[PDB]
Amino acid sequence: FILIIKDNIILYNINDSINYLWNIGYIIMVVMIVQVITGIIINLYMNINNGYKGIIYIIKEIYYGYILRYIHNNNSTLIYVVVYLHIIRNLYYKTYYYNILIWYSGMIMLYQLIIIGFIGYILGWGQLSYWGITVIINLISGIPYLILLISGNYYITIVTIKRLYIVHFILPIILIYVEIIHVYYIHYLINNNIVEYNVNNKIIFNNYILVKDNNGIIFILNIFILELNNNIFIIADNDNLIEINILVTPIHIIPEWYYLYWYSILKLLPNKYSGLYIVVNSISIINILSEYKIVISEYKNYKNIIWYNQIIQYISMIYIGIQLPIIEYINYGRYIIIFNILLLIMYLYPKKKK
Amino acid sequence: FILIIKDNIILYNINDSINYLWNIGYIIMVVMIVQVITGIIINLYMNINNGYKGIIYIIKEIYYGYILRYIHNNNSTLIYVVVYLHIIRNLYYKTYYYNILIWYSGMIMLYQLIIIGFIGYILGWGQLSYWGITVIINLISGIPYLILLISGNYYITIVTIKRLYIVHFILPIILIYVEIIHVYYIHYLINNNIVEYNVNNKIIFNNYILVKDNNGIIFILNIFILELNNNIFIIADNDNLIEINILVTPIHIIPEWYYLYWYSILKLLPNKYSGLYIVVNSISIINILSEYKIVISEYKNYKNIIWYNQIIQYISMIYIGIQLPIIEYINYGRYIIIFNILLLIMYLYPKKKK
Amino acid sequence: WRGKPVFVRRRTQAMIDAATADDAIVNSLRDPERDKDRVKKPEWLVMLGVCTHLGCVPYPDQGLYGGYFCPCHGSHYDHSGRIRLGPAPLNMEIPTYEFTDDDTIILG
Amino acid sequence: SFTPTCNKELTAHIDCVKSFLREARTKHTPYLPGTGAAAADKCSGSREYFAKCTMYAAATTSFRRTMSTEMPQPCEMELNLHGQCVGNYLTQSIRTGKAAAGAARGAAQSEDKCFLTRAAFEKCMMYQKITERATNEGQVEYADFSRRFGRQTQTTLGA
Amino acid sequence: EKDPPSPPDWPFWFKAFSHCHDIPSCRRGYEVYRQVCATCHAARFVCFRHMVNTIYPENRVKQLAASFDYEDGPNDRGEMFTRPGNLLDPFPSPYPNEEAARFANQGASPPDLSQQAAAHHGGCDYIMSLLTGYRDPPAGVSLRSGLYYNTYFPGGAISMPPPLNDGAIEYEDGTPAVASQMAKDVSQFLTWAQ
Amino acid sequence: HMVNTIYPENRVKQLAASFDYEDGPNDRGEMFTRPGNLLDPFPSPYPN
Amino acid sequence: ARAYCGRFAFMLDYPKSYHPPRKNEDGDYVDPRTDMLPKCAAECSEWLTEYNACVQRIKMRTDGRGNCQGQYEEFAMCQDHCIAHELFHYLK
Amino acid sequence: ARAYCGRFAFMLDYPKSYHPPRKNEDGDYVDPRTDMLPKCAAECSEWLTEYNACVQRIKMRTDGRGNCQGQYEEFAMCQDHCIAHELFHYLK
Ligand SMILES: CCCCCCCCCCCCCCCCCC(=O)OC[C@H](COP(=O)([O-])OCC(O)COP(=O)([O-])OC[C@@H](COC(=O)CCCCCCCCCCCCCCCCC)OC(=O)CCCCCCCCCCCCCCCCC)OC(=O)CCCCCCCCCCCCCCCCC
Ligand code: HEC
Ligand code: HEM
Ligand code: HEM
Ligand code: HEM
Ligand code: HEM
Ligand SMILES: COC1=C(OC)C(=O)C(CC=C(C)C)=C(C)C1=O
Ligand SMILES: COC1=C(OC)C(=O)C(CC=C(C)C)=C(C)C1=O
Ligand SMILES: COC1=C(OC)C(=O)C(CC=C(C)C)=C(C)C1=O
Ligand code: FES
């Protein structure tokens, strides 16, 4: 494998005109490894018997256990920040027009990540996680008997945790394999540049791009260390530190911040399945945004007005999700969903000739 | 990877003169996959906080759980049988003389397997398992403070189970990776034949060798199905179904049958470390049995008298291990160890000229 | 049943008539529901005994309607389990249950 | 009088039987069940009691849990607070030799450091009838809001 | 309607990057918890050994734990006995189960205060605000016996009697015992316990 | 475990109901004694 | 997951000095918060007028319906924000 | 891990018929095993002579030391192997 490493790290040529937005991917890979390592180490001191007490036992009895607990929670937030920012970049520079294979490989990892995260918060045995899996499992309540098979009982119980835990342990290793398929296509299908064309300005990776990529990762580390030890930003809801009572409903059954765009979709649409279905549309339509075009152009380096309104639509929907289900937020949020479809249609539609 | 598969399975040429002893390796690979799958599935219903009560809940409450429980225990016995028989073969045909790299890769997997099996026994959380680890861990009692770091307490508790379980979950996946390194050397360094020389008699693998290898595996399956459902051979000690009591010592603290060779070595030698050291010798000296030779010959297809006495030495030591520590068995067993050193010296020593 | 208290009350004719009387004043209730749609047999009320305010378990034969009074914050439910006074927002939920025969129910 | 299941009654008879036999063998005194009480048959009464318990009841097997006839008490929390104050001050007074041990109940509160908490208990008890009609309603969520996604909906598995 | 009123942002010492938990306040907080909150709440996940060499010296923690009686066992005859507490025991719990506790608080359950300093939005600020947030009911709001108004509790009506009264306890260090001090101190201690 | 395998369901009910188990807590936080059911383990003679 | 959000000490306006609580005629220390209540109510006069208006509007209603909790929660939140800025200066 | 080792039924010599236990003069059924004890002791006579010899050798010893458990366990194992071959034929 040493020759492979030399071909893909030491003699790998990349354009010298790339920005720091081309370093986001390096950070995902590094922060992903950290999340696997910390996860395996936490499991050394806790299992599925009672997470509530187990997390307490890690933070109070294990030496430096608090570091492991808070890194694993905060580095998840970090994973989802960097991934979501990696997508925003790919949309801005339309890096899906000629490198769709790379885009497809990435989306597979996005799907896997969305399942890894949801199930990790039930491992903590907290109120907000108990009642948030009870509300997402009941969306497939139409498929007969499927809820019982997944849950393993008629209500969420330790049985449900013992099985989701195995998916949370194993699915990350598969994600790492898909990361190789992703880096494989990137290296074959050359990366896109800040300029729309292809230019002979490439420089080796280890001597230049890795030094710059490390300056980026160390910048993010400074900020992540401050959050890790001082909680400068509230990235974890406090109601997950309340012991599970199956009789009392939490004040608000909301997910973590990185599922509030699909939680709002589900709370805005008036039919449960319509919501589920609009959450499929969000993660699926974005994979065909260049397929119907017919012009010899990649629609790149224009003012990207449609892009800006899409990125804001995401942020605004996350806000509506935090808010309670007040009627006025529901009406305004339904307009934001209608607007997303029109913006998506604009990306999809080919143009007629004057 | 399809081209890789075609190069290593469909257009892979092997000599047509090989016996059914060249099918043992295929069986190891298949039975190994089965042990990983069943282990992961059993994990879906197991609580490592009490594995005594957990195994009961699998066999009585889970549908077809008894199949998973008994396959995972019996397929371990099977793994070790096939591996130990794969070594006996490699010794008989001296397949380490020119393919040492293959031999080295295999020994690495043997070391990993020896750790996986032992820790899996302790997950059963029964009398024999508890006292057995309590005896082994106290062999490294000389290295200061290391028992405490491995155990996590002053005595074996669930704390130790929660950490060894992670080694038992992860180490098998690494073994599968070393299996690739093993199949890599086999395919580059061509396999040895029943004849000492190299002959142009090779035939493709999928159309011929895989059909024969499946006839072999299905033969073993018939026998393994009978053991799996009727316990024709006692391959699991009954004293692992006794609830752990730290105050009472079991009638006999012995390992599974596939650890009895090294258990006897440790119970025969009069100094604890000497015993540990003679166990190291057994699993290390066998890796240099052709290094000091100087003749242009592989010492192959002779009467193999030294080989036969070695294979019997292994069987006889396993017998002494079952037997209680009667003094007579200790004296006789010390002679068998002296004899093994002599047989191993015979393999190692180069010959002078008349 | 499934971790929750399931109150099963045989209802006297007075109790049944009381809920039937409020069946006409429906739409004057926080959560308008008719007793016919909350009971399969008038003589039998099977409900989950969990206050819809903050989960406390109400006590029967208490309150202003002689139904079920949650002492935690003062929610009064009627003889059909419908919220009539207090902080509670909704009516006590009716579980999934069928009648196997005349003298047996099956919860689930 | 008699338990629906006579397991308790039988256990009492067997305990009497076992103790009398143990005493008889240990002290080498006569043991004779179903004979005169003075020297033997000390378990005659227990045996008859179990036989009387055999009257039993209809379908004793069908036990049914029930909510308490009496609800949680009216001012127990206020009373508990006053009790804690009385005990804490008693512990401090005995430790520091204060006169607060005396005059534990004081009208002025000058001699009683627990007078204020006692007054609260008295007021709650006094106003029990006064506030018996109290709605206990502030601002109550309407049902439509209560049953929207993020509130009490999809809250029971299989919804 | 709107979510429960957000707690004010109190200037606790430990909120700065380079600041610690003020041990003098945490010590007073233990006294407030032991003499006021403990009657109804339990701290199951807080053990006496956690306070040794951190809040109190080892001998002092022994005396505190020994003041309580715990149920240990079984003995050689299979019976349960009562012993004084030790440094390895959890903080005493007032009620044996949640159903006993509920029966003593008009059906309401006093939550365990082990992680309450971080179990509510606002965190430590929510404890300080709640304990000092009792008020006369708003006009038009009438509360039954055992129900008290509090601006920060969700809904406004809490089954907890106003717990802090001036002069309720005497601080060993002489600090003036006023309701707001006890609040600031018990909030500090519960934050440390979390 | 014995229902429809060793004994009929009604018979197993009678056997279990013959024993007294300790269940609870009740609404008052107290432990009570009830007849046994098909979901109870076999009775144990001693508490520890 | 945690009790507080960290901040620079220059953003955390911690009391720089301590003013002991006033002592009553009886000699019992008066709660600093109780003394601060009138001053902070004046700072929130605008919300208090809204609440007082509600009280009089619900007083007229000849039915028994009407509450002023909404306006009281806004006044209370305001009065309490004022208290937070100066209360710990009188507390040890 | 399991109670028994499986075998072909032709290797498992199960009783082909049932002989009811004899009834005593009182009318109580006599244990088939007790009736089989003398017959199986005769089949193990060689070990019984060894045990009986030990008893007499330990009887002579003027100290209190001496046991014959070793020889009794060999006799008992033999008598019991004999019983196993024919006892279930008298049991339902
Ligand atoms: C009233 C009820 C009555 C019921 C009556 C029921 C009667 C049933 C009769 C059934 C008869 C079946 C006869 C089949 C003949 C056709 C064979 C054939 O086509 O083979 C080719 C075919 C393969 O074709 P091929 O590759 O072209 O040729 C194979 C060889 O090259 C050709 O050379 P070969 O001749 O040597 O081949 C024979 C066999 C031979 O295979 C074996 O024997 C494999 C095991 C080797 C160890 C052998 C230990 C021997 C111990 C002997 C103990 C003797 C005790 C004597 C006591 C005497 C007391 C008086 O080869 C194989 O089967 C190959 C299996 C490959 C296994 C792959 C894994 C190998 C691992 C490495 C070796 C083992 C290492 C560990 C063991 C080391 C031991 C030191 O072989 C098979 O797959 C045949 C499997 C079946 C074998 C025979 C089974 C006989 C079963 C008799 C049952 C009687 C039941 C009576 C019940 C009565 C109740 C009252
Ligand atoms: C000592 C100063 C304290 C502290 C720090 C707390 N309490 Fe209480 N409390 C009691 C009851 C019955 C409840 C539950 C009421 C219900 O919510 O209806 C509570 C609740 C709490 C909380 C949680 C608030 C939340 O929103 O759930 C907290 C943080 C809290 N308390 C702190 C009852 C009592 C008492 C009974 C008389 C006493 C004494 C205390 N509490 C004292 C304290
Ligand atoms: C587990 C998350 C993922 C990781 C590890 C990851 C990793 C990376 C890496 C290392 C790069 C090359 C360096 C770069 O240019 O920044 C890259 C490129 C790319 N990724 Fe990802 N990615 C992930 C998520 C995604 C997702 C979800 C998508 C699709 C929505 C995606 C689409 C792309 C595309 C199109 C490129 C090529 C960009 C260009 O043309 O250079 N990635 N990714
Ligand atoms: C894509 C990678 C992963 C992500 C995004 C993910 C996500 C998270 C999340 C969000 C939590 C909840 C943290 C909290 O309770 O607030 C969690 C918990 C947990 N994760 Fe992961 N995880 C990843 C991989 C892994 C791996 C590989 C392991 C190791 C088997 C692991 C082990 C655990 C454990 C034991 C918990 C429960 C303890 C905890 O609450 O911190 N995770 N995970
Ligand atoms: C080289 C492969 C492996 C071998 C040789 C091995 C060996 C065994 C052994 C001997 C047992 C004890 C069985 C009994 O209690 O008697 C055991 C237990 C167990 N193993 Fe494995 N194992 C393998 C891989 C795995 C894998 C990959 C997993 C999945 C994470 C797994 C999960 C388990 C579990 C949960 C138990 C406890 C349940 C049990 O007692 O059956 N094992 N293993
Ligand atoms: C996890 C256990 C292992 C598996 C999966 C395995 C697998 C295999 C496979 C598939 C073959 C080729 C087919 C064959 O000729 O049978 C082979 C060859 C070989 N293995 Fe292993 N093996 C293992 C253990 C070992 C060990 C422990 C050793 C060394 C003591 C070893 C040494 C060899 C050698 C020397 C060969 C070449 C034989 C010849 O020259 O053809 N293997 N093995
Ligand atoms: C509590 O955890 C979660 C939710 O709770 C409401 C979600 O809505 C969601 C979003 C679910 C769907 C079906 C889009 C996720 C993933 C989640 O993690
Ligand atoms: C559809 O997938 C999503 C994104 O990628 C396009 C986002 O950018 C966002 C928005 C991300 C940020 C940082 C506001 C989210 C949450 C999302 O769901
Ligand atoms: C329980 O007893 C056991 C032994 O006894 C000494 C072993 O030798 C061994 C074998 C040890 C080595 C290092 C090969 C194991 C695993 C074992 O479990
Ligand atoms: S929980 Fe019943 S009145 Fe609030």
From TrEMBL, chain F:
Cellular location(s): Mitochondrion inner membrane
Organism of origin: Perkinsus marinus (strain ATCC 50983 / TXsc)
Coiled-coil residue spans: none
Annotated family: Belongs to the cytochrome c family.
UniProt lineage: Eukaryota, Sar, Alveolata, Perkinsozoa, Perkinsea
Residues of the full protein shown: 86 to 133 of 278
Protein name: Uncharacterized protein
Automatic annotation (TrEMBL), chains G, H:
Membrane-topology annotation of the record: Peripheral membrane protein
Keyword list, A-Z: Disulfide bond, Electron transport, Membrane, Mitochondrion, Mitochondrion inner membrane, Respiratory chain, Transport
Major subcellular location class: mitochondrion
Residue stretches making up the Ubiquinol-cytochrome C reductase hinge domain: 31-92
Location(s) in or outside the cell: Mitochondrion inner membrane
Biological processes per GO annotation: mitochondrial electron transport, ubiquinol to cytochrome c
A single Gene Ontology CC term: mitochondrial inner membrane
One Pfam family from the record: UCR_hinge
Disulphide linkage map: C40-C82, C44-C78, C54-C68
Family designation: Belongs to the UQCRH/QCR6 family.
Protein name: Ubiquinol-cytochrome c reductase complex 7.8 kDa protein, putative
